[PDB]
Amino acid sequence: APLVDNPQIKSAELLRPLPLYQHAYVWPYVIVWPVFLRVYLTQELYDKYIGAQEWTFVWIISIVTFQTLTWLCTHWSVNLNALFTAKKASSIEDAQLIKVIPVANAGAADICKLVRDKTNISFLFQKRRFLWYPERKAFSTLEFDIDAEPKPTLSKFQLSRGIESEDELKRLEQHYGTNTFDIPVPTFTELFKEHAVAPFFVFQVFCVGLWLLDEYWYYSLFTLVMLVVFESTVVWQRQRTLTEFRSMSIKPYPIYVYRLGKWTEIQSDKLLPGDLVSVTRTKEDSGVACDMILVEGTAIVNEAMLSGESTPLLKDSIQLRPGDAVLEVDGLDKNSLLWGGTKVLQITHGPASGIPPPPDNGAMAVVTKTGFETSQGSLVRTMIYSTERVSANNTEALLFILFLLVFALAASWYVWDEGVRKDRKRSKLLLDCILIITSVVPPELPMELSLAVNTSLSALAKFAIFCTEPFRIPFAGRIDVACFDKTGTLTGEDLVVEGIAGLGLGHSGTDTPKEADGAHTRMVSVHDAGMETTLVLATAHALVKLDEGEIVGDPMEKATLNALGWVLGKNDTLTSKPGNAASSGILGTVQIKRRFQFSSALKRQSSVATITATEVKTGRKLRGSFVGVKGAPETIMKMLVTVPEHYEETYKYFTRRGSRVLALAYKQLTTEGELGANKINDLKRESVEADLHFAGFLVLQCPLKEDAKQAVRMLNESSHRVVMITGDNPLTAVHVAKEVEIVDRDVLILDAPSLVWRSVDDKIRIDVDPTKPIDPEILKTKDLCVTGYALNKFKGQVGWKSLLRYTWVYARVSPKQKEDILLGLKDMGYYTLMAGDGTNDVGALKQAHVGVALLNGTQEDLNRIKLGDASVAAPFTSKLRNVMAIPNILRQGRCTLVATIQMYKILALNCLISAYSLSVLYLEGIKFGDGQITISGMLMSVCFLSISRARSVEGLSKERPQPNIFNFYIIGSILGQFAVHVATLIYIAQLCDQIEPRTEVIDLEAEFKPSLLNSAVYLLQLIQQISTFAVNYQGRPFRESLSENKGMFYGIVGVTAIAFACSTEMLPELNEAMKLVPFNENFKTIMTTVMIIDFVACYVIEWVLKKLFSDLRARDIAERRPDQLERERVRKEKEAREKE
Ligand SMILES: Nc1ncnc2c1ncn2[C@@H]1O[C@H](COP(=O)(O)OP(=O)(O)O)[C@@H](O)[C@H]1O
Ligand code: ALF
Ligand SMILES: [Mg+2]
Ligand SMILES: [Mg+2]
Structure with missing residues (x-):
C-alpha cells in the first residue's frame, strides 16, 4: 500500500506528462479569448459591459493577470503543479513522473523523474537514490552488503579478493554511482x-x-x-x-586498489563497494574516503569528526576471528570499522585470501558504503537539504499583514464612499483605492528573522564559534535550563598524579594513621609503590608511540606514564633498565598482548601482558603472564575475590576533598611462561575480569578552569538555571558544584549504601521507598544530588516528575541516562542547552535544543593555519577551551530576538503612516508630487541603512525578550502610536481646511500644483516617519543606546535638522526643490508645536508600555530565593565600590 517505504516521506503519487496545449493555462483562456474578442468587435455589445476605451484596459489587465496567476500557481505549489500539468497514472508500466511530499519540517516536496535501465526503476529525491522493488511493490532506499537481513558470515569478508570482472564493475558503477558529494553551486x-x-x-x-x-x-x-x-x-x-x-567535502587523492588480480592506482572518487583497498597514513586536509572494514593489520585512528574526542583509537583486524561459522555483529566487531571523515594516524602490522602485499605496505580493508550513504555523508545530506528552514511556520507574519490590511481596507472603503458621494470619475477613484490598499503591505515582513540570523552567525564566527543548523539560533534566546559536564568542560585538561593511596588495606600495615571512621590517610608516591602496583600502572594503558617519536593518548595515562618513569617502546614494550631513583627499582620489561578497550558503560579497562620484573630492595622476582584492570572503585569492588575492611570509607575520604580516585586490580594467569598464542585469542572479557586481587587507588587532581566560575555566575544570575550531568563520583561532583556555586546550601545524596538519602559528612541517613513520593521538607530545605542508580529505579513511579524539578547535580550516569534526563526535561515544557566535549554526550547533544561541542584546542593551532575542521557531533562547535563561549551564544540569540522585534515594529508603523496620509490626501483630489515622494523614499532608505548598525553589550541582563509577534507589547505600542499619529494628522488637515477654504471644484486637469495642504501633510508625514525611527529603536537594555553611537544619531540629527529647516523656511531654494508653499508665522509655530507634541506622546507611550509589558518573566525553575538575590546585590555593590 505505501508507495515509498521511508520514515521521512509522507505521500507519493504516480503522474504522467501532458502536452503543452492540454495544460490548465491554455485551453480555458483560448476558449475565453475569442468570446471577449467578439464582444469587443461588436459595436452594439461594446456599449454595455465594456463602456469607454478606459475599461478595455481594465478587462485586458484582469484577464492577463488571471492567466499569469494560473501559470505561476504551478510554480508556487507542488499540489497545484500536479493538478494542472500532470495527470494521474494507473500502474507503474505507464508512469514517468512521481510527486513526492515529505514529512513536516523535512525539506520541500517536488516532482521527481523516473529513470529506467536494464527492469531497474529508480529516481532521486533530495540527492538520495530510491529504487523500486517489485517483490515488496514499493520504492525504498538502497540496500548494501552489510545491511542484509541475515547478517553475512565473516568468511565473505576474509576471503574476498575484490571485484574481478569488468561487467560487475560496470554494474556496480551503474547501481551505486561514484564516490562523490553531489553539492552543486549554481550561477x-x-x-x-x-x-x-x-x-x-x-x-x-x-x-x-x-x-x-x-x-x-x-x-x-x-x-x-x-x-x-x-x-x-x-x-x-x-x-x-x-x-x-x-567546502566540507574531501579532495580526491590517489589510492591503491586490487582490481582484476592486480594492484592499480585509482583516484579516491572512483571507489565501489566490494573493493579491496590498501590504507596508509593519511595526510593533512584528507581523511578516509569511504567506510571500510579492516581485514589485515592494525590502525591507530583519530575520530574527531564524529565525536568531540581527539584521543586515538586502536582498530584491529578480523583476521584472527573464527568467522567460518560466526555471523558478523556490530557489537563485538565495533573496533574493526573505519569511518569516512576520520584521520588514520598510524598503520602497524605487529593471509587467508592469498594475495601479495600492496606496494605501499599499508593495511588491507574492504569498502562497505560509498557516496551520501556513509555516516558523515548521511549527516551532511540531512544538514544541507532535508532540514527545517529559519522561518518554518510563517503563520504569524502572514496574519500580521492581514491585521494591517484590515485597517487599509477600512480606509479604502471610506475613501471610495466619500468619492462616490461626490460623483468623481470611477477609474481614477478605483486606482486611488487600489493604491491605498497596496501601499500598506511591508515587502520583507516574512523576512527580518532570516536576515538577522546571518548577522548573528557572522558575529559568532568572529568568536571561532561555528553553527551548522542556523534555525536553532532563536532557540538560544529562550533557554531555561543550561546543562553541563564536569571533566573537559568545567575542569582543566592537564592532571597531576598525587600518588597511590590505600596500600595498607588488608592488614598490610599495622601502625598506619587512621581517622575516626576507619579511612586510611597515608598516601604513597608512585615511585615508592609496590611492584604489583607499578606493573598494573604500566600494563593497563592505551598509549601508543608514533614513528616520529611522540606519545598520544588520554591525559591521565600520559600523566601516570610521566610520573611512573618508564619509557615506551616501538613494539608495545615498556622497560626500566637503568637503575636510579627515577626508575625507583621494579626494573624489568612489560610487553602488552591484548587490550580490552575502555567503554563508558562498563567503566573499566583491562589489559593482558607478559612481564619480567624484579624488586631491588626485597628480591621477589616475577615473570610470566599478567592481567591488569583499572576503573571506577564501585565497579572494581564487585569483582574482587575478597573486599578489604576499609574500602568504602577510604575512597570516600579521598574523594571528599575533590580528588579523583581510580581503582586498580591485578591477576596472574600463569606463574611461569607465556599463556600461549592460541589461548590469548580464546580469552573473553567476562572470564578475565573476575577473581582479581587488590592494588592501591590512583589519586589524581583535576584543576578547575579559570573561566568556569565567571561563566557560571554570568549564567546563574540572568534568569537561567545551570545543572551538572557528570559521570564521576557524587562527592567530587558535589565539591566541584559547590566551588563553582551551582549549589549553595547543604547537599543530600540519593544513593544505595537501598536508595538512602545521605549527607556529605555521612552523619544523616534516611531510608526512602521508590513508590512513595519524596518528602516535602527535603525538597523545600535541601539541595538534591540524584545518582544513576536511584534515577534508574525511579523510572515509572510518581517521583520522576518531582526529582527533575529539584535536582541540580546528577552523578554516575551512563551515556543513555544523560539523553534520558534531557528528554525528561524537554517533555515538561522547558528549553534545554547541552555543552559537552566527549563521546559520552553525543547522544545528549543531539536531543537538546542547543548543542555545543567544546573542541578543546589551543589558539596557537589556529595561528598556525572554516567548516572543514568542524565536526558533526553537535549543531554548534567552539574550537577554543574557554567556558565563556556558552554565554556568547545566549547573548547573540537574545540580540537576534530584540532586533527582530524592533524591525517588526518599525515596518508596521512606517507602512500605516503612508497609507493614512495617502487616504487623507485623496479625499480632496490632490496628490503627492513625484519629486517629493522620491525624496521621501530616498531619505527613508538612508535612515534604514544608518539604523542597521548595532553592537552588543558585554553582559547578560535579567530581562528576557518576547519571542513572538502577538504580545501585549507590540500590539499595544503599535496601536497607541498609530492613534497618536492619526489624531495629529486629522487635526492638521482640519486646521488647513479651516485656514484656506476649498472651492469644491475638481477640474479635469490633474497636473500637480503647490498647495498648503500638500506641503503640510508631506512635512508632517516625513517628521512622523523620522520620529517613528527615533523612538522605536529597541536598544536600551540589550544593545548600545541611541546617543552612545554616532553612526545613527548623527544621521537622525541631520535629517531632523533638514526637515525643520524646510519647515522654518530658512533655505528657500530647498523649499522650492520639493515645491513647498510659503507659510505664515502662526502656522509655522502651530505646526512645530504639533510635531513636538506628537513626538513626546509617542515616546511616553512607548516608554510606559516597554517598562510595563516587555519583560517576559523567568520560569519557576529559574527563580531565586531572596538570600541569593541579596548576596548578588552585596557582591555587585562591593565590586562597584572596588572598581575605583
Ligand atoms: N581511561 C580510563 N581507564 C580506566 N577508567 C577510566 C578511564 N576513563 C574514565 N574512567 C573511569 O570511568 C568512570 C566513568 O567515566 P565516564 O562517565 O565514562 O567519563 P567521565 O569520567 O568524563 O564522566 C570514571 O569514574 C572514571 O574513573
Ligand atoms: F566528565 Al563526563 F561525561 F565528560 F562525566
Ligand atoms: Mg565530557
Ligand atoms: Mg571522557
Whole structure:
C-alpha cells in the first residue's frame, strides 16, 4: 500500500506528462479569448459591459493577470503543479513522473523523474537514490552488503579478493554511482530565475506597475532599483552559504586498489563497494574516503569528526576471528570499522585470501558504503537539504499583514464612499483605492528573522564559534535550563598524579594513621609503590608511540606514564633498565598482548601482558603472564575475590576533598611462561575480569578552569538555571558544584549504601521507598544530588516528575541516562542547552535544543593555519577551551530576538503612516508630487541603512525578550502610536481646511500644483516617519543606546535638522526643490508645536508600555530565593565600590 517505504516521506503519487496545449493555462483562456474578442468587435455589445476605451484596459489587465496567476500557481505549489500539468497514472508500466511530499519540517516536496535501465526503476529525491522493488511493490532506499537481513558470515569478508570482472564493475558503477558529494553551486542567473517567481517578488513588480500607471516616472525606477539590489544581495548570501557547505567535502587523492588480480592506482572518487583497498597514513586536509572494514593489520585512528574526542583509537583486524561459522555483529566487531571523515594516524602490522602485499605496505580493508550513504555523508545530506528552514511556520507574519490590511481596507472603503458621494470619475477613484490598499503591505515582513540570523552567525564566527543548523539560533534566546559536564568542560585538561593511596588495606600495615571512621590517610608516591602496583600502572594503558617519536593518548595515562618513569617502546614494550631513583627499582620489561578497550558503560579497562620484573630492595622476582584492570572503585569492588575492611570509607575520604580516585586490580594467569598464542585469542572479557586481587587507588587532581566560575555566575544570575550531568563520583561532583556555586546550601545524596538519602559528612541517613513520593521538607530545605542508580529505579513511579524539578547535580550516569534526563526535561515544557566535549554526550547533544561541542584546542593551532575542521557531533562547535563561549551564544540569540522585534515594529508603523496620509490626501483630489515622494523614499532608505548598525553589550541582563509577534507589547505600542499619529494628522488637515477654504471644484486637469495642504501633510508625514525611527529603536537594555553611537544619531540629527529647516523656511531654494508653499508665522509655530507634541506622546507611550509589558518573566525553575538575590546585590555593590 505505501508507495515509498521511508520514515521521512509522507505521500507519493504516480503522474504522467501532458502536452503543452492540454495544460490548465491554455485551453480555458483560448476558449475565453475569442468570446471577449467578439464582444469587443461588436459595436452594439461594446456599449454595455465594456463602456469607454478606459475599461478595455481594465478587462485586458484582469484577464492577463488571471492567466499569469494560473501559470505561476504551478510554480508556487507542488499540489497545484500536479493538478494542472500532470495527470494521474494507473500502474507503474505507464508512469514517468512521481510527486513526492515529505514529512513536516523535512525539506520541500517536488516532482521527481523516473529513470529506467536494464527492469531497474529508480529516481532521486533530495540527492538520495530510491529504487523500486517489485517483490515488496514499493520504492525504498538502497540496500548494501552489510545491511542484509541475515547478517553475512565473516568468511565473505576474509576471503574476498575484490571485484574481478569488468561487467560487475560496470554494474556496480551503474547501481551505486561514484564516490562523490553531489553539492552543486549554481550561477547568479539560475538563482535569480528561481527567486523572481516567489509570491513576494511578483507583488512588488505589480505594485511598481500600479504606480507607473498613475504617471509616476521617478518613483518606480527608484523602487525597482532597490528591489533588484535587495534580491541580488539575497542571492549572493545564498551562494556564499552553498559554497561554505561545499567546502566540507574531501579532495580526491590517489589510492591503491586490487582490481582484476592486480594492484592499480585509482583516484579516491572512483571507489565501489566490494573493493579491496590498501590504507596508509593519511595526510593533512584528507581523511578516509569511504567506510571500510579492516581485514589485515592494525590502525591507530583519530575520530574527531564524529565525536568531540581527539584521543586515538586502536582498530584491529578480523583476521584472527573464527568467522567460518560466526555471523558478523556490530557489537563485538565495533573496533574493526573505519569511518569516512576520520584521520588514520598510524598503520602497524605487529593471509587467508592469498594475495601479495600492496606496494605501499599499508593495511588491507574492504569498502562497505560509498557516496551520501556513509555516516558523515548521511549527516551532511540531512544538514544541507532535508532540514527545517529559519522561518518554518510563517503563520504569524502572514496574519500580521492581514491585521494591517484590515485597517487599509477600512480606509479604502471610506475613501471610495466619500468619492462616490461626490460623483468623481470611477477609474481614477478605483486606482486611488487600489493604491491605498497596496501601499500598506511591508515587502520583507516574512523576512527580518532570516536576515538577522546571518548577522548573528557572522558575529559568532568572529568568536571561532561555528553553527551548522542556523534555525536553532532563536532557540538560544529562550533557554531555561543550561546543562553541563564536569571533566573537559568545567575542569582543566592537564592532571597531576598525587600518588597511590590505600596500600595498607588488608592488614598490610599495622601502625598506619587512621581517622575516626576507619579511612586510611597515608598516601604513597608512585615511585615508592609496590611492584604489583607499578606493573598494573604500566600494563593497563592505551598509549601508543608514533614513528616520529611522540606519545598520544588520554591525559591521565600520559600523566601516570610521566610520573611512573618508564619509557615506551616501538613494539608495545615498556622497560626500566637503568637503575636510579627515577626508575625507583621494579626494573624489568612489560610487553602488552591484548587490550580490552575502555567503554563508558562498563567503566573499566583491562589489559593482558607478559612481564619480567624484579624488586631491588626485597628480591621477589616475577615473570610470566599478567592481567591488569583499572576503573571506577564501585565497579572494581564487585569483582574482587575478597573486599578489604576499609574500602568504602577510604575512597570516600579521598574523594571528599575533590580528588579523583581510580581503582586498580591485578591477576596472574600463569606463574611461569607465556599463556600461549592460541589461548590469548580464546580469552573473553567476562572470564578475565573476575577473581582479581587488590592494588592501591590512583589519586589524581583535576584543576578547575579559570573561566568556569565567571561563566557560571554570568549564567546563574540572568534568569537561567545551570545543572551538572557528570559521570564521576557524587562527592567530587558535589565539591566541584559547590566551588563553582551551582549549589549553595547543604547537599543530600540519593544513593544505595537501598536508595538512602545521605549527607556529605555521612552523619544523616534516611531510608526512602521508590513508590512513595519524596518528602516535602527535603525538597523545600535541601539541595538534591540524584545518582544513576536511584534515577534508574525511579523510572515509572510518581517521583520522576518531582526529582527533575529539584535536582541540580546528577552523578554516575551512563551515556543513555544523560539523553534520558534531557528528554525528561524537554517533555515538561522547558528549553534545554547541552555543552559537552566527549563521546559520552553525543547522544545528549543531539536531543537538546542547543548543542555545543567544546573542541578543546589551543589558539596557537589556529595561528598556525572554516567548516572543514568542524565536526558533526553537535549543531554548534567552539574550537577554543574557554567556558565563556556558552554565554556568547545566549547573548547573540537574545540580540537576534530584540532586533527582530524592533524591525517588526518599525515596518508596521512606517507602512500605516503612508497609507493614512495617502487616504487623507485623496479625499480632496490632490496628490503627492513625484519629486517629493522620491525624496521621501530616498531619505527613508538612508535612515534604514544608518539604523542597521548595532553592537552588543558585554553582559547578560535579567530581562528576557518576547519571542513572538502577538504580545501585549507590540500590539499595544503599535496601536497607541498609530492613534497618536492619526489624531495629529486629522487635526492638521482640519486646521488647513479651516485656514484656506476649498472651492469644491475638481477640474479635469490633474497636473500637480503647490498647495498648503500638500506641503503640510508631506512635512508632517516625513517628521512622523523620522520620529517613528527615533523612538522605536529597541536598544536600551540589550544593545548600545541611541546617543552612545554616532553612526545613527548623527544621521537622525541631520535629517531632523533638514526637515525643520524646510519647515522654518530658512533655505528657500530647498523649499522650492520639493515645491513647498510659503507659510505664515502662526502656522509655522502651530505646526512645530504639533510635531513636538506628537513626538513626546509617542515616546511616553512607548516608554510606559516597554517598562510595563516587555519583560517576559523567568520560569519557576529559574527563580531565586531572596538570600541569593541579596548576596548578588552585596557582591555587585562591593565590586562597584572596588572598581575605583
Ligand atoms: N581511561 C580510563 N581507564 C580506566 N577508567 C577510566 C578511564 N576513563 C574514565 N574512567 C573511569 O570511568 C568512570 C566513568 O567515566 P565516564 O562517565 O565514562 O567519563 P567521565 O569520567 O568524563 O564522566 C570514571 O569514574 C572514571 O574513573
Ligand atoms: F566528565 Al563526563 F561525561 F565528560 F562525566
Ligand atoms: Mg565530557
Ligand atoms: Mg571522557
